[PDB]
């Protein structure tokens, strides 16, 4: 009704009408800008305006500064948004980040257990509630888009991202797609499968990743080839993408991996033919980081081809993330030369705009300062603590069938020992994608280590001694009632985590042997995956697979001291040796140390 009315700016109008109205006004430069996502590290107000940039991200560890507050994050994001809103059309950018176990790049964010442990809970409603809390903590920092969930079905634990997979069993991964409506909100009653959805300003856009077969690569080699017939691809690796469509996942990220030698980032048949045309996905498809570069061998050796192949394959938004001028220049040339039709550009931009309008981003482009206090909120930590406890799998509770069960341990004892490299190391208990991509060691954020949790749990008369790596004599002479010893993997992600031997670093086993040799012991194993465990088992009275439980170490002691019983069950096969791999439930020659679904129980004290 005002004389300067512009339909796309009218919040009362249907999303599709707003999309069409804006699209019809855009120049080629404005269109290609929407398709471009850049790192905050290369962003400036002029770059964002002049190139009509559609999206920014923080990669792992890409932060305004170490220890930044929620408000500092909001101010940074809003500064970028102010630049984007100052363009001719005022299209807001969407800011993405890997919030994969909480808002994990941010100091003081609640850190939830990694996905493998969540699979052990068999509790999809718990995972939904984690999505809900994670959305609040992401919005606390002004960010609107999380690159989660990873719905890989990890079929070989030698993969460095196996901890990002809920299970080797697709049925468990499918169940855990409940993360999506946690992050985004529940879809309405009449909802069409494949449409994008986000409820509003207190929720975030989600991302089902990495499409498809990322968990199926040969020998678990990250980014490698997945060799499997269509029937197996569709039976193992694809199903959870359909659940994600049904729950309105807003975006899908493409895998670095290949399927039978075809790069996913160049696979028109799967990206356009299947995801878009068969599953009816109507959100946007985003590349992985320099994913189009890696289409070629060597990577980046023909970036012109990378742009052509990826955009023709059906990708909508490119996580460049640094060389935006080159990306934009090359894509512009391809359109100008008729190599890429305007129809393909218009489809990509239609999808990007659909997600942005749907989620309310044109109505609330800026951060809400009242949300900053959601970061690290005690209610969310209480949830993480529940999740950590439910994730724990009890593998042994007594050396013989006639021994007294060691767990639960008594809170009142004259003197107890807490030992091991992982007993008082917050970074190690969080693992990868915590503060940095690869994670880190020591007190990297706000949390409670296993040692701190023990001290918070025990009777006031119980003396707690910590020794990181005590010798056998120290233990034998110490007058201890029992010991809790924690060891395991160091933090990792992506290719750095690929590991053909799956043996934990020393000292780990040597400390368990020294401790358990002198006093009854409960071994807590911190890992992203099954690892060689027979020697640890042989030494230990009790052993718990605690995965990567996150910031809330009291989840571990909640079960050790019997406040709750152990309930977790293995979401993966535990192998006898790495020579067996790959080896999954349902295989012909299945000879596990512990089958998928195994877990001992205790009752609460």
Numbering used by the authors: -2 to 602
Please quote the paper that reports this structure.
In the barley β-d-glucan glucohydrolase, a glycoside hydrolase family 3 (GH3) enzyme, the Trp286/Trp434 clamp ensures β-d-glucosides binding, which is fundamental for substrate hydrolysis during plant growth and development. HvExoI folds into a two-domain structure consisting of an (α/β)8 barrel (domain 1) and an (α/β)6 sandwich (domain 2) with a 13 Å-deep active site pocket embracing the subsites −1 and +1, positioned at the interface between the two domains.
The well-defined electron density maps of the (1,3)-linked thio-ligands illustrated that the saccharide moieties were attached through the networks of H-bonds formed between nine to ten residues in each case. The W434A mutant was sensitive to 4NP-G3SG and G4SG-OMe, and the data with 4NP-G3SG correlated with substrate specificity and catalytic efficiency. Remarkably, W434A lost all hydrolytic activities with poly- and oligosaccharides, except (1,3)-β-d-linked β-d-glucosides, turning this mutant into a strict (1,3)-β-d-glucosidase, albeit with low specific activities. Conversely, the cluster analysis of the G3OG product in W434A indicated a dramatic shift in poses to ~15% of the populations located in the +1 and +2 subsites, and ~74% to the intermediary (midway) poses at the −1 and +1 subsites.
